[PDB]
Design a protein around this nucleic acid. Structure first.
Lengths: 196, 183, 96, 169
RNA sequence: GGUACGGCGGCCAUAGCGGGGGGGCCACACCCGGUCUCAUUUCGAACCCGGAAGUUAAGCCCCCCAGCGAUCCCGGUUGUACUGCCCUCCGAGAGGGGGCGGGAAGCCGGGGACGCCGCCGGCCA
RNA sequence: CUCAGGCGGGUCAGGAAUCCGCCGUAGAGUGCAAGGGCAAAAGCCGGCCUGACUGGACCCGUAACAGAGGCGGGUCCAGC
């Protein structure tokens, strides 16, 4: 600020966190918001309702709890983890009694086949009634984890050092990069049994 | 020239590896100043020299002294990053004598020089793309923590401490290649 | 020279925002709600051009008598006549 | 030149916006500082009006020439600083009137004047002790040219009023 | 219940701009690589995808300041400038004045201020 | 996606052709006067379109208070 006429933006706008025009458009619906956010290593899914003194999150689900409880040793920043988190948040919302919600991806661009839409698909399969169009859902093989295993096999066939550098932490965690779809299926079955 | 903070800068870089500068990008421009056969020859020349499709830069405002019009393509531009940029920068710096004048480093360590002819790493005066040679090459440097000011979400500002300077740019360019002259 | 009244006649300062308030207003006024019989002040927000009443009524206090679509129905007493306005909630402020 | 009593009073609104006033004339007074502004001087003699008034640029120029000539003759160029603190911004107009009287009577610009409040300084003469009488005489000569009652005051470097002290001494 | 952890927000500068010191269980980042999803009017620079070799240099988190900007309180200018009502008050005029009721802006001096608050989750216990 | 202007550095290239970096509260732009409003836009650049449509209701302004033919505008229901 360098004068009385300077206009200091909102705190969230300055921090680059909230898109206020999209927020107003979402809040005009009057329905719960399924907020989806992604970091470098994790995913966050929340069910939020509006309040003039500050929004209240009725149901929250962090992908870090997949490592515990059910048990998931895969990287928590990929499409299978996003799908599992979406299923978790959908089942939690259905348990809590929330039947309808509208997706909120914040500042993330709407690129088809992304992790946010993977979370949306997971919630839809869980049972949450979120309006959408199926054309944006990621491909089933990508959701299951076929691409990850395919690149793991390609790297193993190629220079083994490249494969070791790419998936070094998987070996330390004890999970072979192959059979990751099998591990994902096991975790999905465990979650379905727990919530049904 | 002479940089009095040489050993201090080297010690700082060794102590903090993430403060070590790196090449943000290398930009090659050719302002032929006209649209047509010469412009196409320059585009073909850049395609062979670099390996990626260049960009036709049009004219801003209409100037009649140069005989240009708004929207008419004028110049050709290419940008390179990564090890390909490193190799091409080595070739371009070896093209001319590996000497850079002191009065060419920007206030933030970036450099800009020019190559008038095709006296460089391998090339030929082939019948096509002949005479369109002559470019200006700008090297933009950066410290690793520079994505913050460029990303969209959670964008912030880089302090003067983390911003580069002319002396550090000269030191890095020395440690990479070349030499500097007092012109 | 006589000049007929128009929507934006002599509104240079009435419909001008503070330099430090330039931009979108906070969403609380946008999303605020009212009940039938509530009394509300009329404070026009210049940046929002939808559902704006006539600026002649800016600053007056009316009563809510209904709601059509997104706009509220406000009744005012101009002299002795009852005048009905359809005002977006962003242009309204609760009394007290 | 019409009588100054017409423009003496300040009952009319300010008329200064050159962006909208068509045909406004250029200033007739262009010099506002004379002598040696850089050099320091122990005493300053300022002239104030006793009432709000509009002083015409013609009167300002006449007073400037008279006082400058007197000070140049008696004190010397490097021994005084004469400054006029006000600038003529008000635009004086006159109704342009075969011939239609009082029809479309808005006036066309004819001159400039400076509008001053009550007890506002008009001009200052900075001198040392040995030229105080000359400064006072110049102030009186300037006051003789203005359309309002005027009085002089003497201030030191700090700004305190010392006219009685100086005149008694 | 603790945490120099994060997500969504309310007031929208007393919260901003600019400086100094410290920190990484977790977490957030910088960062490594572009087969697959996605993109360049070129460029994996952005966006997206797949990760954890290295780093706390900075984004971020914690503590501090008063150079700029803003703004709250106290004292002076000052009940000054201005002003509502009445008047058989003065003034050649311009205008001013008496009684009752209100009352600045700017400037100087001394403090304040480098934000406050709501919902929830992660880690530990 | 961010403008005007400015600074520093660049082969012809100069005050002005094209390009790299930084400062940059809008000092640009928004078809046309002026005022008001607009910065992850209402500006610039692209994709897809015709809601510049059909059948109707209520209300405000011209025309305050306080009467009005015609006209302009706002809030909606239904169809496509």
């Amino acid at each position: 600020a360098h004068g009385p006429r300077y206009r200091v933006p909102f705190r969230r706008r300055r921090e680059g966190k909230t898109n206020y025009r999209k927020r107003l458009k979402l809040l005009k619906s009057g329905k719960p918001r399924l907020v989806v956010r992604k970091s470098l290593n994790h995913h966050i899914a929340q069910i939020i309702v509006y309040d003039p003194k500050g929004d209240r999150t009725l149901v929250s689900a962090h992908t870090r709890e997949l490592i515990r409880d059910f048990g998931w040793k895969g990287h928590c920043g990929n499409t299978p983890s996003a799908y599992l988190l979406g299923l978790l948040i959908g089942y939690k919302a259905k348990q809590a009694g929330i039947e309808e919600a509208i997706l909120d991806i914040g500042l993330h661009p709407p690129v088809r086949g992304s992790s946010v839409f993977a979370v949306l698909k997971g919630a839809v399969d869980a049972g949450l009634n979120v309006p959408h169009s199926p054309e944006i859902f990621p491909d089933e093989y990508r959701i299951r984890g076929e691409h990850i295993a395919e690149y793991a096999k390609m790297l193993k066939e190629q220079d083994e050092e490249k494969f070791r550098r790419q998936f070094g932490g998987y070996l330390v965690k004890g999970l072979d990069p192959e059979k990751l779809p099998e591990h994902f299926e096991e975790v999905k079955a465990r979650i379905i049994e727990k919530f049904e | 020239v002479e940089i009095p903070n040489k050993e201090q800068i080297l010690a700082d870089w060794e102590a903090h590896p993430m403060r070590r500068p790196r090449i943000e990008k290398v930009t090659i421009n050719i302002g032929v100043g006209e649209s047509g056969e010469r412009l196409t020859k320059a585009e073909i020349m850049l395609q062979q020299l670099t390996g990626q499709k260049p960009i036709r830069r049009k004219a801003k405002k209409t100037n009649r002294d140069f005989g240009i019009r708004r929207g008419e393509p004028i110049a050709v531009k290419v940008t390179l990053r990564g090890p390909k940029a490193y190799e091409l920068l080595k070739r371009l710096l070896a093209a001319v004598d590996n000497r850079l004048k002191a009065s060419s480093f920007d206030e933030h360590g970036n450099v800009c020089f020019g190559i008038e002819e095709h006296i460089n790493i391998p090339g030929v005066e082939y019948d096509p793309e002949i005479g369109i040679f002559g470019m200006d090459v700008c090297v933009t440097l950066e410290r690793p923590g520079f994505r913050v000011a460029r990303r969209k979400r959670k964008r912030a500002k880089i302090p003067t401490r983390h911003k580069l300077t002319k002396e550090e740019g000269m030191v890095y360019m020395m440690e990479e290649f070349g030499v500097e002259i007092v012109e | 020279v006589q000049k007929a009244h128009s929507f934006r006649r002599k509104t240079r300062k009435k419909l001008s925002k503070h330099p430090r308030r330039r931009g979108l207003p906070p969403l609380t006024r946008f999303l605020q709600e009212f009940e039938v019989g509530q009394r509300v002040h009329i404070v026009i927000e210049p940046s929002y051009h939808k559902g704006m009443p006539d600026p002649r009524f800016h600053g007056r206090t009316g009563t809510v008598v209904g709601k059509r679509g997104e706009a509220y129905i406000v009744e005012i007493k101009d002299g002795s006549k009852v005048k009905t306005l359809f005002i977006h909630p962003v242009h309204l402020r609760p009394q007290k | 030149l019409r009588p100054a009593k017409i423009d003496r009073y300040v009952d009319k609104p300010a008329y200064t916006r050159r962006e909208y006033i068509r045909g406004a004339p250029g200033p007739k007074i262009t010099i506002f500082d004379m002598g040696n502004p850089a050099g320091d001087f122990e005493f300053e003699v300022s002239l104030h009006t006793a009432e709000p008034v509009q002083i015409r640029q013609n009167a300002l120029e006449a007073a400037r020439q008279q006082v400058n000539r007197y000070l140049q003759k008696n004190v010397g160029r490097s021994n005084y600083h004469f400054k006029i603190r006000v600038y003529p911004f008000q635009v004086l107009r006159e109704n342009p009137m075969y011939g239609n009287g009082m029809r479309r009577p808005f006036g066309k610009p004819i001159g400039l004047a400076a509008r001053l409040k009550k007890d506002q300084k008009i001009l200052s003469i900075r001198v040392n002790r040995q030229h105080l009488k000359f400064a006072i005489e110049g102030a009186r000569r300037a006051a003789m040219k203005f359309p309002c009652k005027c009085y002089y005051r003497i201030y030191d470097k700090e700004g305190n009023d010392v006219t009685t002290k100086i005149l008694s001494q």
